[PDB]
Amino acid sequence: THWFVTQRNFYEPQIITTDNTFVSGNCDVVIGIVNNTVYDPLQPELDS
């Protein structure tokens, strides 16, 4: 039901963030891509 990111050799699920991910191109370019929230720790830290 919920998406995560994890180290391939041992299941330890992590929150999908811009610390755990990087970007290239756009959503039209990649085969098999899906829709999901990418969180960012800087957001509550600015807002609070």
Partner 1 sequence: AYRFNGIGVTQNVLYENQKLIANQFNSAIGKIQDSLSSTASALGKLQDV
Ligand X SMILES: CC(=O)N[C@@H]1[C@@H](O)[C@H](O)[C@@H](CO)O[C@H]1O
Ligand Y SMILES: *[C@@H]1O[C@H](CO)[C@@H](O[C@@H]2O[C@H](CO)[C@@H](O)[C@H](O)[C@H]2NC(C)=O)[C@H](O)[C@H]1NC(C)=O
Which residues of this chain interact with partner 1, rule CB under 8 A?
8, 22, 24-25, 29-31
Q: Which two tokens stand for residue 21?
A: 């991910």
Q: Is the dihedral of CA 20, 25, 26, 30 positive or negative?
A: negative
Let me know: does 5 contact 22? Beta carbons within 8 Å: no
Among ligand X, ligand Y, a copy of itself, none, what binds residue 24 when CB lies within 5 to 8 Å by partner kind? a copy of itself
Q: Give the helix/strand (H/E) hosting 12.
A: none
Q: What mask of x and - would describe binding to ligand X in positions 1 to 40, judged by CB under 6 A?
A: ------------------------------xx--------
Which spans of this chain sit near ligand X (rule: CB under 6 A)?
A: 31-32
